[PDB]
Amino acid sequence: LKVPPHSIEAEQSVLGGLMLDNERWDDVAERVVADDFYTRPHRHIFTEMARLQESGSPIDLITLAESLERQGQLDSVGGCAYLAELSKNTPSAANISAYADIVRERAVVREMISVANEIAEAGFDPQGRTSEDLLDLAESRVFKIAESRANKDEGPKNIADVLDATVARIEQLFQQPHDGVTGVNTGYDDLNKKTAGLQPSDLIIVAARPSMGKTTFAMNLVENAAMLQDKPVLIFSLEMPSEQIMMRSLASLSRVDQTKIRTGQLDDEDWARISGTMGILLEKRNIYIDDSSGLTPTEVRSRARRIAREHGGIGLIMIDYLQLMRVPALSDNRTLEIAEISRSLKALAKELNVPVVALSQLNRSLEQRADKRPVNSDLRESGSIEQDADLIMFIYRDEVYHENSDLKGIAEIIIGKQRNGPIGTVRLTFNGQWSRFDNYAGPQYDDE
Amino acid sequence: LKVPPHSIEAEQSVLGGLMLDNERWDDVAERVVADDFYTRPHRHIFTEMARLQESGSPIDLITLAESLERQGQLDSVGGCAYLAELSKNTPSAANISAYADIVRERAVVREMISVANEIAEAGFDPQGRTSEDLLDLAESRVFKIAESRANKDEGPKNIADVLDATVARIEQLFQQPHDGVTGVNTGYDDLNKKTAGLQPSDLIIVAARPSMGKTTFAMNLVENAAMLQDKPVLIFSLEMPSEQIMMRSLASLSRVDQTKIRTGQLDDEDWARISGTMGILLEKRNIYIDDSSGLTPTEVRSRARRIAREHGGIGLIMIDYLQLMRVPALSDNRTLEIAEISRSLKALAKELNVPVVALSQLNRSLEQRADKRPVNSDLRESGSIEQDADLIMFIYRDEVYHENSDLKGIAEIIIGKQRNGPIGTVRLTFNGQWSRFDNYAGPQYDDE
Amino acid sequence: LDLAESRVFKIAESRANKDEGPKNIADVLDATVARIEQLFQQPHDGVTGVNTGYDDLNKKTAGLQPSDLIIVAARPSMGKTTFAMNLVENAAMLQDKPVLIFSLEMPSEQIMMRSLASLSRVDQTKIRTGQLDDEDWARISGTMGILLEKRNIYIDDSSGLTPTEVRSRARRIAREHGGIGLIMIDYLQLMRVPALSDNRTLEIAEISRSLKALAKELNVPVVALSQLNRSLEQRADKRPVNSDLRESGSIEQDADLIMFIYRDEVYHENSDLKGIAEIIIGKQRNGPIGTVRLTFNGQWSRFDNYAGPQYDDE
Amino acid sequence: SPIDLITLAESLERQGQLDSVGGCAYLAELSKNTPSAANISAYADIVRERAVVREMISVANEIAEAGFDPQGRTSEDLLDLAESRVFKIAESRANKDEGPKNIADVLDATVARIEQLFQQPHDGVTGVNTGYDDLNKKTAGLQPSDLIIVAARPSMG
DNA sequence: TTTTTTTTTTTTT
Ligand SMILES: Nc1ncnc2c1ncn2[C@@H]1O[C@H](COP(=O)(O)OP(=O)(O)O)[C@@H](O)[C@H]1O
Ligand SMILES: Nc1ncnc2c1ncn2[C@@H]1O[C@H](COP(=O)(O)OP(=O)(O)O)[C@@H](O)[C@H]1O
Ligand code: ALF
Ligand code: ALF
Ligand code: ALF
Ligand SMILES: [Mg+2]
Ligand SMILES: [Mg+2]
C-alpha cells in the first residue's frame, strides 16, 4: 500500500501560519490552492480561509471555527481542538512560503503519479485506440505538467519590431545615444551597452589564453565596479597572492609603470599618485580579497555569506580561477569536479543575486586553428562550464600571435554567449605599461 | 494479477509461418524484434532464427532445434516437441504480417505500461531529486517510446508510382498559368526565364567578391519574392545588423539614397516614400529577421520550422552568410564544418520544400586569372558548397576592376550551376546609390 | 608436441580447405572451363554484361559485367547524374531484370523528370514549366505507357543511407524479383557510417569496400557516383584523372571501371567540341583505357552515341 | 531553505533517512535539548577537535598495521606512506587562516610592504640576480615564491 | 569519463 507522497506537517504548518499571520496569505495564495492539500479536512479549512479572506474577514481561530460551524463542516475537521493544534504546531509563520512551496511540490508529484496511473490504465485497456492515440494521450497529459517551463523568444523578431527599432535609432542618431545601464557598471561604454552591466544572479565566465590579461581585465572590472558602487566586491585570488593583485590594482589606478612599483623605483609624482590611490581605496573599503589556495565551493559560499551578512550584500564576486577549485569528493573525475564547481558557483550567484566573474582557461587546440579567435567550445571541460555560464567573454589579442599586427595595443572582448543579449566583438585599448584596459577611441570597424 | 497485455497466438503464428516460409522473414524482420515476444522462449527462438538467417541457412524445425541445442537452449524453450507444436499450429504464412504487427502492438503496449510504472515509482520516491528532474525523466521516457516506433522510410518505390506522382504534378503545373515561373517569383525577367523562379526544396547559392553588392541582390530578390507571395520570408543576416539590412531594403524600395537614410537626411518626399513602404510592410507582416551570428544549422532549422508551423509554410529563406555559421562539433576542421553546414541547409530546404538562398564568399586566386568572371572553383572553402548547391549565381562587376569598362552600371549574374536548366549570363542595372538591381533594358548581347 | 600439432592439423585445415579456404587449382580450372563453355554455348554480340546502349562504350567495356564496381565521376554540372540515368534507362529497356536507384542527391521527382525528358527527347524546361504541346504530351504518354509496361525500375530517395541499409534493400529487391540487373547509387559521399564518422577517409573507404562486397555478393553491376576535387581545375589540362576524386584513396583502389566525364565546352566558351562530352575510361581491370565521345543534349538531358568524325587517340 | 525541525524531517523522509536518524521524536529531542546557539562556535570547534583526534588515531592504527604487515613493501615505502598520511592531516587544518577577513588590515599590510620594498634602494634587481643585464631588467631577477619554466627543443642548451 | 601524445590519410590555402 504505497501511500501517495504528501506532507501532513507542511499542510499543518501552512494552516497554522495562516491562522497566525493573515498578511502572508497572498504569498501562499500564489503558490498553492485548496486541492494541493492531501488531506480533505485541510482542503476544507483552506477553502474556508479563502472565503473569509475574499469577504475580508480576518483569519483567526475564532472566526474560522465560527465559519466552519455555520457550514456544519467544523465536526469534519475536528473543532476548536484540531484548529488550535494546527495553530500550535507551527514553529513560525515566517517560513510559510517554504511550506507552501513544499506543498506545491507534493501536489505536482501527486499529479504526475495520477497522470502515470491514467496512462498505464490506458495502456492496459487501449479500447481500440491506436498506438499513436495512446502516445498522443500520454504527451498531452505530460504537457500539462510542463506548463511552468515555456520557451520565451528564441530570436525571430518580426518586421514591425525591426521598423520600430530602425525608426527609433534613426531619430536618436540626432539625439543622445544613451546606453541604458541597469546592471553593475563595467566601466566601458561598449561593454556596458552590449551587456547592460553585470547582471545580478547571472554567471559570467571570462576566458582567455594565459598572459592575455584575463586577471588584468577582471581586476579592472572589479575596480571600476568598486569606484561606481558602494556595495562591497569580493575576489578569490587562488592563482596569485594578494600582494601581486594589489600591486596590479594600484598600477592600473595610478596609471604608473607597474615595473617601477614592483621594483620600488617610484618618483615623487608617482609616489603622490600612489598616495592618492591609497587614500581613495582606504576611503572606499568596498573590496575584499582572499588569497586562499585550493578553495572548495562550500568554503567560498560560506565566506561570501559571511561578508554579505556583515555588509548587507556584495556588489561583485570574482574567482581566479575555476580550474584551481577543489572537490575532494569528485577528485576521481576532473570533468565531474569542474561541472559540480560550476553548478555550485551558479547556485551561489543566484542565491546571493550578485554578478560572479569566475575565470577559466582554454585547451591548446585553439592555437591549432588557422584563426585563433576563441569560441565557446575552446573552454577546458567546456561540457559543463558552457552550459552553466550565462555570459561568456573571451579575450583575444592579434598582436600576441602576430608581431606585425596592425591592431597593436588593441584587445578584443568577444561576448560569445549571452542569454539576454547579443553576442559579438568589442575593442579596448590595452596599456600593458599600466596593465589596464580603456575604452577604444579608435576608428570603428564594421562588425562583419 | 494484472498481467501485461500479450498475444501468444500471434507469436506462435509468426514462428510457424517463418518455419514454413523463409522468404517472409523480412516482413517479420521490419515489424518485430526478438525482445518484443512476451515469453522468453519465443525471444530465444526468434533470436536463433535471426542467427540462422544471418548465416543464410534455411530456417526450419530441425535447424532451429539444433541451433538452440548447440547453445543449450533446446530444453529451455520446450524441446523439439514445442517447436513441432508451433510449426503444426500455424496453417499458413499469408497473414504473417498481421500477426507480426499484433506482436509489435502488444510489445509497445507493454513498453508503455513499463514506462508509466517507472514514472509512477519515481514520483513516489524522488530520492532527493527535484520535481523538474522527474518531469524531464517522464518526458524523455515518453519520447523514447514515440521515436522507437519509427518506420520513417518510404522504402523501395516502384517506378509506376513515381511516374504517377510526377505526371500529376506536371498536370497541376500546366493547369494554373504562371508565365513559366514555377517557383516563387524573383522579379527579374531573364532570371525567371533561365530558372523559372526559385523552385521548392532548392538550396540556391549567390556569391560575389567584396564590395560587389553580394547582399544587395539577395535583398532585392527577397523583396520581390515577399511582395509577390502570401507566404512569409525569413532572413538570417549573420553578416550585418538588422538595422542596416532594413535601411538598405527601404532605400531599394523607395529608391532613396542609402547615404541619406544612414545619415538621416530625409526630406518630405523621401520621408513620404519611406512611410508608404512602412505602411506596405505593416500591411504585409510577412518578413522575419534574425541577426544572430555563428548560428549552427540546427538553430536555422528550428527557427525556419517555427515560421513554417506558425504561418503554414515558408515562401523563401535568406542567409547572409554561410561562412559565418559555426558547428562546434567539427569546429577544428573547417572543411568538415562547411560540409555539415551545406548538407544540413540542403536537407532543411528539402524538408520544408522552400528555397533557401544562402550567400558565400570567393577566393582571392580568382583575381590572378586573365578572366575575372567567377567560376565554382573560386569559392572560399569550396569543396562541398558547389556539390550541394542547386543553382549558383556569381555576381560580376567589371566596373569595380576596370574604370574603363564599357558596362558601367551593369552587373552580370553568371549561372555557374543549374541542375534543371542551362547556364549563361544575365545583365542587370545596378543602382549602388539606391542599393538595388533592376532588369537590364539596354542593348542585348547574344551569348557566344 | 609435434604429435599433438599433427593431430590438430588433421582436423582444422583438413576440414577448412574442403568446404572453404584455399581452393585447389583443379576446381578453379573446372569452374573457368565451365564458364568458358557457357560462353561458347551462347552466341552473343560480344556485350557479355548488361548492354550500355552505346556503341563505343559497349565495344570498350563489353557491357556492364557482373560483380564489378563502376565509378562515374565528374565535376558538378557535368551530367554525371544525367549519364548515369541514361545508362540505367538503357539497361532497363535492354533487359528484363529490374534495376534499383538510390537518389540521395535529388528527389525522385527531379530524376523522373530528367528520365522522361531523355526518353521522350523533350526539353527539360518545358516539362518543368508545364509548357507542353500536344505532341510533347503524346510522347510523354507513350513513354509512360512503355515504363508502366516494363515495371522493372525502382527508386529510393532516402537520405543518410548506410551501406548496410543499401545491402538490406538490395537483398530484399533481389529476393522479390529473383535478382537485380543493375544497381545505381547517387552518390557515394552522401552515405553514412556512424562508426567511422570521426575520420571521413575511413568512412569513405568502408563505404567503398562494403559496396564492392555487395556487388560481388549479388553478382550484379553497381554504378556508384562520386565528385572530384578542385585541384583538377588548377592544372593547365582540366581533363579529370584518378587523383581528382574527393576522398580519393580507397575509391580507385576498389573500383573496377572508372569513367570521368569531361566537357571542354564548359571551361572553353569558344570550344570547337560544343555538344561533345568525353567519357574517359581511366581504369578497366579487364580491358583498355581510353576516351569515348558522346553527344550531350542538355535540352533533353540525354547522352547519345557520337556520330561525328572519329579523332585518332594520341 | 530554512533549517528547521519540520523541513529537515521532511527532507530526510524524502530520502527515506528520517527513521535512520531516530525519527521526528529524535529530531524534537535534539531541538529541545539545545537552549540557545550562542556557544555554537565552541561546540563546533569541540566536534572538530574530536574528529581530528579520531583521524589521527585512525592514521596511527593504519601505520601500525602496515608495519606489522608490510605485504612486501620496504621500510622506505611505509615511512613515506606515514609521511603522506601525517602531512594530509596537518594540511587539513589550514581552515582558520587564509580568508577574506576585514580588508582594511590586509590593504594596510600590503601598502606597508610596498612602502618597505620602495625604501630598500635596490639596483633594479629585487630578487635572485640572473647575471644578465637585460634579463634582470625585464624580470628584476628570479622573484621569491615564483615558478620559472625554461623550455626549448633538446640540444638547445 | 577525460586530457595528451603523435602517427596516418585527406582536404584547404
Ligand atoms: N611592464 C609591462 N609592459 C607591458 N605589458 C605588461 C607589463 N606587465 C605586464 N604586462 C602584460 O600583462 C599581461 C598579464 O598576464 P597574466 O595576468 O599572466 O595573463 P592572464 O591573467 O590573462 O592569464 C601579460 O600578458 C603582459 O603582456
Ligand atoms: N534546358 C537545358 N538546356 C541546355 N542544357 C541543360 C538544360 N537543362 C540542363 N542542362 C544541362 O544538364 C546538366 C545537368 O547538371 P547536373 O545533373 O548537375 O550535372 P552532374 O549530375 O554531373 O553534377 C547541366 O550541366 C546543364 O548544362
Ligand atoms: F596565466 Al593567468 F590568469 F595569469 F591564466
Ligand atoms: F551537381 Al551533380 F551530380 F548534379 F554533382
Ligand atoms: F633535453 Al637535454 F640536454 F636537457 F637533451
Ligand atoms: Mg592571471
Ligand atoms: Mg547530378
Swiss-Prot record, chain C:
- EC nos: 5.6.2.3
At which positions is ATP bound? Answer: S77, K80, T81, R285
> Which UniProt keywords are present, listed alphabetically?
ATP-binding, DNA replication, DNA-binding, Helicase, Hydrolase, Isomerase, Nucleotide-binding, Primosome, Stress response
- Reaction equation(s) it catalyzes: Couples ATP hydrolysis with the unwinding of duplex DNA at the replication fork by translocating in the 5'-3' direction. This creates two antiparallel DNA single strands (ssDNA). The leading ssDNA polymer is the template for DNA polymerase III holoenzyme which synthesizes a continuous strand; ATP + H2O = ADP + phosphate + H(+)
Question: Which species is this record about?
Answer: Escherichia coli (strain K12)
State the name under which the record lists this protein.
Answer: Replicative DNA helicase DnaB
What's the encoding gene here? dnaB
| Span within the parent record | 158 to 471 of 471
User: One GO CC annotation, please?
Assistant: DnaB-DnaC-DnaT-PriA-PriC complex
Enzyme class, broadest EC rank: isomerase
Task: Give the protein's cofactors.
Answer: Mg(2+)
Describe how its activity is regulated. Answer: 5'-3' DNA helicase activity is stimulated 2-fold by single-stranded binding protein (SSB) and 6-fold by SSB and DnaG primase.
UniProt lists the family membership as follows: Belongs to the helicase family. DnaB subfamily.
In the record's own words, the domains note is: Loader protein DnaC alters the inter-domain and inter-subunit interactions of DnaB, inducing an open ring conformation that allows ssDNA to access the interior of the DnaB(6)DnaC(6) ring.
List the GO molecular function terms: 5'-3' DNA helicase activity; ATP binding; ATP hydrolysis activity; DNA binding; DNA helicase activity; helicase activity; identical protein binding
Induction of its expression: Slightly induced by hydroxyurea.
Record keyword DNA-binding present: yes
Q: Where is the SF4 helicase domain?
A: 43-310
Mention one GO biological process in which this protein takes part, according to its record. Answer: DNA replication initiation
Q: How does it assemble?
A: Homohexamer ring. The helix loader is a DnaB(6):DnaC(6) complex with a cracked opening large enough to allow ssDNA into the central cavity. Component of the replication restart primosome, which is composed of PriA, PriB, PriC, DnaB and DnaT; DnaC is required to load the helicase on the replication fork DNA while DnaG primase associates transiently with this complex. Interacts with PriC alone and in the DnaB-DnaC complex, probably 1:1 binding with PriC. (Microbial infection) Forms a DnaB(6):lambda P(5) complex in the presence of ssDNA. Lambda P helicase loader reconfigures the DnaB hexameric ring, generating an opening large enough to permit ssDNA into the central channel.
> How many and how are cofactors bound here?
Hexameric enzyme depends on Mg(2+); in its absence, DnaB is trimeric.
Task: Tell me, in a sentence or two, what this protein's role is.
Answer: The main replicative DNA helicase, it participates in initiation and elongation during chromosome replication. Travels ahead of the DNA replisome, separating dsDNA into templates for DNA synthesis. A processive ATP-dependent 5'-3' DNA helicase that acts on preformed replication forks (have single-stranded (ss)DNA tails). ATP is the best nucleotide for helicase activity; GTP, CTP, dCTP and dATP are poor substitutes. Participates with DNA primase DnaG in primer RNA (pRNA) synthesis during initiation of DNA replication. Has DNA-dependent ATPase activity.
